[PDB]
Amino acid sequence: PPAYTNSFTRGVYYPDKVFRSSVLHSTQDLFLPFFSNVTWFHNPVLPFNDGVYFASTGWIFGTTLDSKTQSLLIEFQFCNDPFLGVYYHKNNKSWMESEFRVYSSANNCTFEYVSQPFKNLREFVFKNIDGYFKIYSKHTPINLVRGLPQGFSALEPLVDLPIGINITRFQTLAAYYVGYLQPRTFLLKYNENGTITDAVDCALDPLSETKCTLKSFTVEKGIYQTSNF
Amino acid sequence: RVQPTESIVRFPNITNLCPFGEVFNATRFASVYAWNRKRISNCVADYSVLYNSASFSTFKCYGVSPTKLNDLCFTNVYADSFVIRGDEVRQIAPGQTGNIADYNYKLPDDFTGCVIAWNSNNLDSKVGGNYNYLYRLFRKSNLKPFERDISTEIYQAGSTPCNGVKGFNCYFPLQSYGFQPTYGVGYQPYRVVVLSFELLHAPATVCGPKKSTNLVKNKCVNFNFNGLTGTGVLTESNKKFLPFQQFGRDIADTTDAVRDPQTLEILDITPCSFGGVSVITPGTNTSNQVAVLYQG
Amino acid sequence: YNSASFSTFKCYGVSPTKLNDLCFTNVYADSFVIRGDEVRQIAPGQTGN
Amino acid sequence: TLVKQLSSNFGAISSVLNDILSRLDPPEAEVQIDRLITGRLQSLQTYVTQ
Ligand SMILES: *[C@@H]1O[C@H](CO)[C@@H](O)[C@H](O)[C@H]1NC(C)=O
Ligand SMILES: *[C@@H]1O[C@H](CO)[C@@H](O)[C@H](O)[C@H]1NC(C)=O
Ligand SMILES: *[C@@H]1O[C@H](CO)[C@@H](O)[C@H](O)[C@H]1NC(C)=O
Ligand SMILES: *[C@@H]1O[C@H](CO)[C@@H](O)[C@H](O)[C@H]1NC(C)=O
């Protein structure tokens, strides 16, 4: 039973590696359109389009999920109901990972990486372009229950892992939001500290595309021309 | 304008050497139908040291001068190793049509790299022919740049069903080279490698072994930061990058702040003093002394 | 091309999948009947009797 | 607009002279140099006429 909630100006992330300060630069990249309905779930298989926006208060990427093609985890024969189990022991008051039934076996492996061992809100953006798997995130503390906070917050990149394989489906491992990225062009405002304070759409609203044409956040009273029909 | 006084060079300290033994003459080479791809990172790529392990008979590049390979550092170089016939070396070219160039591994029009191939006499030649190497001949549609095919279906010609239904006009697209030493030189096996890479799209990874020098500030000189060359003063930067920044641009879209690869610091860039020179005179007939005026 | 009634239907030097889309000048046809062991002899780069 | 005109490749490899000079040999350098020069000259002519 999926639920639909309107997005509120979220999903802006630094498009490139360059530092700009107090500039009104514009660029085109795979972004999240503003005010778009996003599925709300409270473990279905979700198709992976050109881009995904995950934000909730363990991920599985693959195609067949039967140890026939390599699958990103963060050749595995996934179970019918793959999950993770943390058991609260009675002998000692601690939470151990007694139950582990994520997959069956791993025969062939291409790349393996293990990092260091490891109320709020986590935002995640996944995109595979030119064989690179880039993850964007920001751990933003909030104290709300329902309704994504209004405002803006950039998403700094975490790391790039070069894999470059087919990704069509993904399954998560409890409320989470999933949105889909589309090719769009925004006008990314910058400040003295070189942070993206605000941004504006260029295809949503004729006023927005007027702002896009003028390259400013204030529109003087009068008539303007934007595009061609 | 004032001329630079000296020059400086800064390059990350890397001692690893890129392994080319498997890329060059080795025990096995892949097929054109399933072309192998290898990743090269965090090592040193030299070209003059490539003339002692295996013989070279084809040394050409498209987009990069083959005499500056030790001058500019690279980023994410790709090497594709496979074997094709000797009469197909011209087919591996940007925008040049060909049987392999259409129904097999192709090359994008904006390719920037080198294509290297050498003749194989008996390394990949058998008396009865080499049937291990397969080359596609039939395809429903042309491949997009850097695409692989693994399907073993029987090509469909006409209205007769194929793809497992063997019958009329059903042909297997994969044929065998059948390399034999008795054949002509134009049909001998050729081990071709393709070097594709990106420049200034990310932090530098594979660079030439030319060492860095001590950093000098307050004097505008020729600087080369990670393959970026220019001219300007070097001064400390009060503005602070994020941990994932290394370049800086302005409204003019020109580089002005570059992270030092060695000391991991930030240096601001500003061109040397520049302006215009004008002179005034009270009249040639009256006298000869003149005055000099500078503008900026 | 899709007659499905010819024992041998082969085109050499051109793509047999695209021939009703090319304009030529003259067409010359020669027809004769040969034995079953002589079909392979009739081919480019082939010799025999 | 005159300043923004710099970043256009004009059909050449890149919009910066330094990259072209280092990457290519002198015999092949001119093929991009003249391509850049024609565009920049056209931009200057437009600016001066305006
Ligand atoms: C999103 O779609 C759902 C139904 O698919 C609809 O109920 C909801 O109103 C839509 N949201 C927007 C943007 O109007
Ligand atoms: C796993 O790797 C081995 C060794 O390369 C190979 O023989 C085997 O076919 C691989 N498994 C699958 C399912 O292809
Ligand atoms: C990925 O897989 C889908 C089906 O699972 C297929 O349609 C698509 O062509 C594949 N793409 C690549 C690049 O392998
Ligand atoms: C910019 O950064 C400085 C350095 O911390 C800070 O003092 C200043 O408040 C920042 N400007 C803002 C947040 O507008």
Q: State how far the Cα of A50 lies from the Cα of A35, in Å rounded to an integer.
A: 19
For chain C, how big is the Rg over CA atoms in Å?
A: 13
Nearest residue by C-alpha to atom 3 in ligand 4: A193
What's the gap between Cα B211 and its chain centre? 21
Which residue in B105, B131, B121, B127 sits closest to B54, CA to CA? Answer: B121
- For tokens 């190497």, the residue is B133
For B141, the token pair is: 């549609």
CA distances from B271 to B128, B230, B256, B274, D18 (A): 68, 9, 9, 8, 14
Q: State how far the Cα of B31 lies from the Cα of B44, in Å rounded to an integer.
A: 27
Residue C17 to residue B159, Cβ atoms within 8 A: no
Interface residue A16 vs chain B (CB under 8 A): no
What's the gap between Cα B264 and its chain centre? 27
CA atoms within 13 A on the CB side of B4: 16
- Choose among A19, A23, A162: nearest Cβ to B245: A19
In angstroms, the first-to-last Cα distance of chain C is 29
For chain D, how big is the Rg over CA atoms in Å?
A: 12
Side chain identity at residue D23, one-letter code: R
Q: State how far the Cα of A92 lies from the Cα of B67, in Å rounded to an integer.
A: 69
Nearest residue by C-alpha to atom 5 in ligand 4: A193
Which residue in A10, A126, A119 sits closest to A57, CA to CA? Answer: A119
Which residue in A59, A40, A69, A38 sits closest to A126, CA to CA? Answer: A59
**Cβ neighbour number for residue B113 with a 10 Å cutoff:** 20
For D18, the token pair is: 């330094």
Rounded to the nearest whole angstrom, what is the distance from the C-alpha of residue B241 to the centroid of ligand 4?
A: 13
What's the gap between Cα B111 and its chain centre? 8
Rounded to the nearest whole angstrom, what is the distance from the C-alpha of residue A3 to the centroid of ligand 1?
A: 9
Interface residue A110 vs chain B (CB under 8 A): no
Quick one: three-class SS letters along chain B? Answer: CCCCCCEEEECCCCCCECCCCCCCCCCCCCECCCCEEEEECCCECCCHHHCCCCCCCEEEEECCCCCCCCCCCEEEEEEEEEEEEHHHHHHCCCCCCCHHHHHCCCCCCCCCEEEEEEECCCCCCCCCCCCCCEEECCCCCCCCCCCCCCCCCCEECCCCCCCCCCCCCEECCEEECCCCCCCCHHHCEEEEEEEEEECCCCCCCECCCCCCCCCCCCCCEEEEECCEEEEEEEEECCCCCCCCCCEEECCCCCECEEECCCCCCEEEEECCCCCCEEEECCCCCCCCCCEEEECC
The technique is cryo-EM
CA distances from B228 to A15, A21, A66, B247, B261 (A): 22, 21, 47, 10, 12
Query: Which chains does D contact via 3+ CB–CB distances below 8 A?
Result: B
Strands A18-19 and B247-248: what pairing? parallel
Rounded to the nearest whole angstrom, what is the distance from the C-alpha of residue A68 to the centroid of ligand 2?
A: 10
For A223, phi then psi, to 5°, come to -100, 145
Q: What angle do CA B48, B54, B59 make, to 5 degrees?
A: 55
Report the atom number in ligand 2 closest to the C-alpha of A108: 1
For A148, the token pair is: 């994504």
- For C8, name the nearest residue in chain B, comparing CA atoms only: B168
For B155, the token pair is: 């090509």
Interface residue B245 vs chain A (CB under 8 A): yes
**By CB neighbour count within 10 A (0-12 exposed, 13-18 middle, 19+ buried), where does B88 fall?**
buried
Q: State how far the Cα of A118 lies from the Cα of C2, in Å rounded to an integer.
A: 66
A51 within 8 A of A29, measured Cβ to Cβ: no
Q: State how far the Cα of B22 lies from the Cα of B39, in Å rounded to an integer.
A: 12
Q: State how far the Cα of B81 lies from the Cα of B79, in Å rounded to an integer.
A: 6
In angstroms, the first-to-last Cα distance of chain B is 11
A162 CB neighbours in chain B (<8 A) are 39, 76
Interacting residues of B230 by C-beta distance below 8 A, sequence separation 6+ = B222, B223, B255, B269, D18
**Cβ neighbour number for residue B55 with a 10 Å cutoff:** 11
Rounded to the nearest whole angstrom, what is the distance from the C-alpha of residue B135 to the centroid of ligand 3?
A: 22
Q: Is A105 in the pocket of ligand 2 (CB under 6 A)?
A: no
Q: Can you tell me whether residue D37 is helix, strand or coil? A: helix
Interacting residues of B282 by C-beta distance below 8 A, sequence separation 6+ = none
Q: What angle do CA A93, A98, A99 make, to 5 degrees?
A: 135
**Cβ neighbour number for residue A90 with a 10 Å cutoff:** 6
Query: Which chains does A contact via 3+ CB–CB distances below 8 A?
Result: B
For A207, phi then psi, to 5°, come to -60, -40
CA distances from A198 to A153, B2, B213, B245 (A): 8, 42, 42, 20
Nearest residue by C-alpha to atom 9 in ligand 2: A108
Q: State how far the Cα of A65 lies from the Cα of A77, in Å rounded to an integer.
A: 6
- Choose among A17, A23, A162: nearest Cβ to B245: A17
Q: State how far the Cα of A197 lies from the Cα of A191, in Å rounded to an integer.
A: 7
For A84, the token pair is: 């993770």
For chain B, how big is the Rg over CA atoms in Å?
A: 28
- For tokens 């697209």, the residue is B173
A43 within 8 A of A65, measured Cβ to Cβ: no
Q: Can you tell me whether residue C48 is helix, strand or coil? A: coil
For B117, the token pair is: 């191939």
For A185, the token pair is: 């062009």
Torsion of Cα atoms, B11 then B16 then B21 then B24, to 10°: -10
A30 within 8 A of A183, measured Cβ to Cβ: yes
Residue B249's beta-bridge partner residues? B255
Count each helix (H run) and each strand (E run) in chain D, helices first: 2, 0
Q: State how far the Cα of B67 lies from the Cα of D29, in Å rounded to an integer.
A: 14
Length of chain D: 50
B253 CB neighbours in chain D (<8 A) are 4, 6-7
Residue C12 DSSP one-character state: S
Give the number of whichever ligand sits closest to the CA of residue A38: 1
Residue B135's beta-bridge partner residues? B175
For D6, the token pair is: 């710099």
CA atoms within 13 A on the CB side of A112: 6
**By CB neighbour count within 10 A (0-12 exposed, 13-18 middle, 19+ buried), where does A109 fall?**
exposed
Interface residue B109 vs chain D (CB under 8 A): no
CA distances from B57 to A72, B107, B192, B193 (A): 42, 21, 10, 12
Residue C4 to residue B157, Cβ atoms within 8 A: no
Min Cα–Cα distance to chain B from A17, Å? 6
Min Cα–Cα distance to chain B from D37, Å? 19
Interface residue B265 vs chain D (CB under 8 A): no
Q: State how far the Cα of B268 lies from the Cα of B234, in Å rounded to an integer.
A: 6
Which residue in B163, B158, B188, B159 sits closest to B173, CA to CA? Answer: B163
Q: State how far the Cα of D20 lies from the Cα of D28, in Å rounded to an integer.
A: 10
Torsion of Cα atoms, B118 then B121 then B127 then B131, to 10°: -10
**Cβ neighbour number for residue B196 with a 10 Å cutoff:** 19
Quick one: three-class SS letters along chain A? Answer: CCEEEECCCCCCCCCCCEECCCCCCEEEEEECCCCCEEEEECCCCEECCCCEEEEECCEEEECCCCCCCCCEECCEEECCCCCEEEEECCCCCCEEEEEECCEEEECCCCCCCCCCCCCCEEEEEEEEECCEEEEEEEEECCCCCCCCCCCCCCCEEEEEEECCCCCCEEEECCCEEEEECEEEEEEECCCCCCCCCCEECCCCCHHHHHHHHHCCCCCCCCCCCCCCC
CA atoms within 13 A on the CB side of C29: 1
For A200, the token pair is: 């504006």
Q: State how far the Cα of B233 lies from the Cα of B219, in Å rounded to an integer.
A: 5
Q: State how far the Cα of A109 lies from the Cα of B7, in Å rounded to an integer.
A: 48
A53 within 8 A of A178, measured Cβ to Cβ: yes
Which residue in B242, B250, B246, B241 sits closest to B227, CA to CA? Answer: B246
Q: State how far the Cα of D21 lies from the Cα of D36, in Å rounded to an integer.
A: 13
Provide the resolution (angstroms).
3.7
Q: State how far the Cα of B85 lies from the Cα of B267, in Å rounded to an integer.
A: 53
Q: Can you tell me whether residue C17 is helix, strand or coil? A: coil
Interface residue B72 vs chain D (CB under 8 A): yes
CA atoms within 13 A on the CB side of B179: 25
**Cβ neighbour number for residue A78 with a 10 Å cutoff:** 19
- For tokens 């935002």, the residue is A123
**By CB neighbour count within 10 A (0-12 exposed, 13-18 middle, 19+ buried), where does A14 fall?**
buried
